[PDB]
Paper text:
Using IS21 as a model transposase system, we show how an [name] regulator uses nucleotide-controlled assembly and DNA deformation to enable structure-based site selectivity, transposase recruitment, and activation and integration. The [name] transposase possess two helix-turn-helix (HTH) DNA-binding domains, a DDE catalytic motif and a β-barrel followed by a flexible carboxy-terminal region. [name], similar to the MuB and TnsC helper proteins, is a member of the [name]+ family and a close paralogue of the DnaC/I helicase loader. However, this tetramer state is inactive and requires the regulatory [name] factor to perform transposition.
We therefore used an [name] mutant with reduced [name] and integration activity (Walker B; [name]) to form a more stable complex that seemed identical to that formed by the wild-type proteins. The cryo-EM structure showed that the IS21 holo-transpososome is formed by one [name] tetramer and two [name] decamers. Two [name] decamers are also seen to dimerize in the presence of the transposase. Notably, they do not assemble into a continuous filament but instead interact in a head-to-head configuration (that is, through the interior terminal dimers of each decamer, labelled 1 and 1′ in Fig. 2c). However, the interaction between the two [name] decamers also induces the DNA to adopt a sharp deformation at their junction to give rise to a kinked S-shaped configuration overall. In particular, the dyad-proximal [name]+ subunits of [name], for which nucleotide-binding sites are oriented towards [name] (monomers 1a and 1a′), interact with the catalytic monomers of the transposase. For [name], this recognition occurs through the C-terminal β-barrels of the catalytic transposase subunits that are flexibly tethered to the DDE domains of the enzyme. These elements dock into a deep exterior cleft formed between the N-terminal dimerization and C-terminal [name] domains of [name]. We therefore performed both particle subtraction (to remove the flexible parts of the transposase and the [name]+ oligomers) and focused refinement of the holo-transpososome core; the resultant 3.2 Å reconstruction of [name]-bound [name] revealed that the density in these active sites is most consistent with ADP. In particular, new and specific contacts established between the β-barrels and the DDE modules of the lower-most (integration-site proximal) [name] monomers with the [name] [name] induce a large-scale rotation of the integrase domains (72°). This conformational change helps to reorientate the catalytic triad of the transposase into the appropriate spacing and geometry to perform transposition.
Numbering used by the authors:
A (entry chain F): 186 to 246
B (entry chain M), C (entry chain N), D (entry chain K): 0 to 246
Write the structure that this text describes.
Amino acid sequence: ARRYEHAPIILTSNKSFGEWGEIVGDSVLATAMLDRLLHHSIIFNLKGESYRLREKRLQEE
Amino acid sequence: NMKERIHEYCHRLHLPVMAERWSAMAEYASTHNISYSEFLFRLLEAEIVEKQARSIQTLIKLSKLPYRKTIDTFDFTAQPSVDERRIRELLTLSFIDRKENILFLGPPGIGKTHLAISIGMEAIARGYKTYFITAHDLVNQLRRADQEGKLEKKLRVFVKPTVLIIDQMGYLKLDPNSAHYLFQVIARRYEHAPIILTSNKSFGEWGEIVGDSVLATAMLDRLLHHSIIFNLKGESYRLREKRLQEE
Amino acid sequence: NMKERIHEYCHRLHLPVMAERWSAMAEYASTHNISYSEFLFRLLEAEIVEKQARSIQTLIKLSKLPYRKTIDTFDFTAQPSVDERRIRELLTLSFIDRKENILFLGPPGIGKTHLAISIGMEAIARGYKTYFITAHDLVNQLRRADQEGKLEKKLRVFVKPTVLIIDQMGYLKLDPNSAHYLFQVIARRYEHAPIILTSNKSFGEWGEIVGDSVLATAMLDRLLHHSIIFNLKGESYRLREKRLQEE
Amino acid sequence: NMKERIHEYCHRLHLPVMAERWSAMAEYASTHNISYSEFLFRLLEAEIVEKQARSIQTLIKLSKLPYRKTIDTFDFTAQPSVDERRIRELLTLSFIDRKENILFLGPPGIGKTHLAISIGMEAIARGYKTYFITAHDLVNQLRRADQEGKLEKKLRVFVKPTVLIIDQMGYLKLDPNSAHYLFQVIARRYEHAPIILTSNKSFGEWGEIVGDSVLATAMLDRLLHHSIIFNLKGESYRLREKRLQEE
Ligand SMILES: Nc1ncnc2c1ncn2[C@@H]1O[C@H](COP(=O)(O)OP(=O)(O)OP(=O)(O)O)[C@@H](O)[C@H]1O
Ligand SMILES: Nc1ncnc2c1ncn2[C@@H]1O[C@H](COP(=O)(O)OP(=O)(O)OP(=O)(O)O)[C@@H](O)[C@H]1O
Ligand SMILES: Nc1ncnc2c1ncn2[C@@H]1O[C@H](COP(=O)(O)OP(=O)(O)OP(=O)(O)O)[C@@H](O)[C@H]1O
Ligand SMILES: [Mg+2]
Ligand SMILES: [Mg+2]
Ligand SMILES: [Mg+2]
């Protein structure tokens, strides 16, 4: 809220927005957070093999 | 013969009251030569009156009303804050048709519980299903239902009643868990049945009461979207009675 | 007016019969000289006649009998083997009060199931609970109940009935599992309620029927401790009627 | 033989007291040829007296009574403030029927808790259940009940007794959590059982004592709705006794 429409927030997560209700243990509060955040948001759904694992494989070979 | 067969018939119909009452009304008909239509009308009238009285008593038994009280035993002179117009409008039970939540606010001892219980009694008498519970008791019931796996059953029994009278909301502080239980109850009763509530704390204090500001705001919005609140203030009836006994 | 309120009360008491019979009895009494007591007696008579008809229909709905038939429909001249004395003694249902099980034996086509069904129908009319099931269907029900964990419920609902009629015992062979299910049923109904059974195989064949000699012996002992057996023989009524139709 | 069987039967009936009472009453009757009815009356009366004395002692032991004291061992001359009329009216226990709470206020040393304990002992003697506890200990016990999840059990055991004697209310300051615990205790006993309390602070100070003005007002209203207050003032009995010992 303090950084809502006042300064950008760069956040990295691994759970969909719906799961935030369980993550924080409050469905209403999680929904409020998501609604306020998505009002000014840019989403990046990244999919791919873990670069750590690929680097480890390359080191092995 | 005749009388024994008649008694067996009446008890088969599940109406021993009818059994005894047809005797009185048949004797009356013979004593005054009452038409058969009027005789049956009397039989049915008395049987229906007794059946409805027993049904009202059973409904009161099922409802966990701490005590029975009626607006007749209320003083509208010592409490200028209340207006007889609005009290009678509530007694009309138009809020049930219009789905309006009735709330009472004010310091202890005013008598906010008396009007709510009288309205509940009138609703029960007219046939509406009304249930009474305290905030502490309601929270306990919800927690136990969640623990025992019968949360659905208790939510159903708390939501189905046409009127749900939550009492002592504010004296006892609530944790976020109880806050979410109360939120579930309110959401189930969002726009499905009126809620009657009594409290002594301002709406702002509900944030501290429930331990979560946003939950308090959501519950307040849901409850007050369709609500009528009576903010009563004045002298405590308990203190006035104590003073009167002293003098 | 008076008629509309009368009908309202009658339906509220669940008595559309009362609305109907009051019309008829009122018309008759206005066209006759019926003292109010006798008018009420006629009213209750009509009410209970219709009520008993509805109760019998509901009981038959709950009951799972194959078809409706009466002992009077059974002719004894075409089947001299049966004796009207014992058949009518069974019709009196004195065996039920004595906790005596009834067994019918003989080649198919004689009409034992007719007598069993007639006794069941008379028991239903007199108010005694009566349930019907075939051996194969009963075994299927018990097996499914054990599989689904509802064995206790099915055992309770099959032991509670005052009269239980097992049919088609002998046509289909039983594995030891079905044998133990049947033994459970019999043991629950050892000396608690009569059992009416029909079969086409002698008692000795039951050992191979149930796939266990000892279980067959135990079940036969328990069943025949207090029972009456009709070893009826003659001509297959189905084939005789087919021949009569041909000629 | 005879005596051994008599003793065994008395013990089986759970009356060894009656076993010894006939050992004496039989000799007494032999000395005077007492009637059988009077003999049995003697036995039964002695048994009842002994059992009642043992039950009273057990009730005293169960109740957390720091010491036993009677109003007889209390001089009202040294305390002109107390009126013997009102003290004996309290001793009559008429407040129990009227559900009137008794409060003793005043500076330390007068002996208010002496009167409270005397009333508790009278209640024990007359059969009325009484439980004596300090405010600090009550708060601690309620907190433990909340912590361990047996709050219902502790509230039940602290509300069932006919009389609850809260002592040392005012010496120790209470936080709002303890205030809500005390409010729960009061509410469960709002109009169900009289409460006896002793304090040294005026009602106004209770707001700071409990850390909540509104809770203090609610508790005071519930306590004083049906109550009789005794604000005793004078010289401290402990100080007077110390002076007497010095001189
Ligand atoms: N105007 C009134 N006429 C008659 N009885 C009244 C009136 N107001 C209150 N009472 C009765 O006085 C007693 C105290 O009032 P009540 O407890 O209902 O009020 P309250 O302010 O909701 O109380 P609290 O917050 O202490 O629980 C109750 O018996 C109530 O029925
Ligand atoms: N006395 C009778 N009067 C009329 N029909 C009869 C009589 N006895 C037998 N029937 C006929 O017999 C058939 C009834 O057979 P029922 O099931 O009662 O005997 P069953 O020997 O147990 O039969 P199943 O062949 O099924 O083993 C019907 O056709 C019925 O009409
Ligand atoms: N009138 C009296 N006659 C005899 N003993 C008395 C009398 N008044 C008080 N006492 C004794 O004086 C002591 C003080 O009594 P108690 O503790 O009940 O007083 P209190 O004013 O309630 O005390 P505090 O406020 O210090 O807790 C006790 O031993 C009590 O028995
Ligand atoms: Mg109230
Ligand atoms: Mg057959
Ligand atoms: Mg003291």
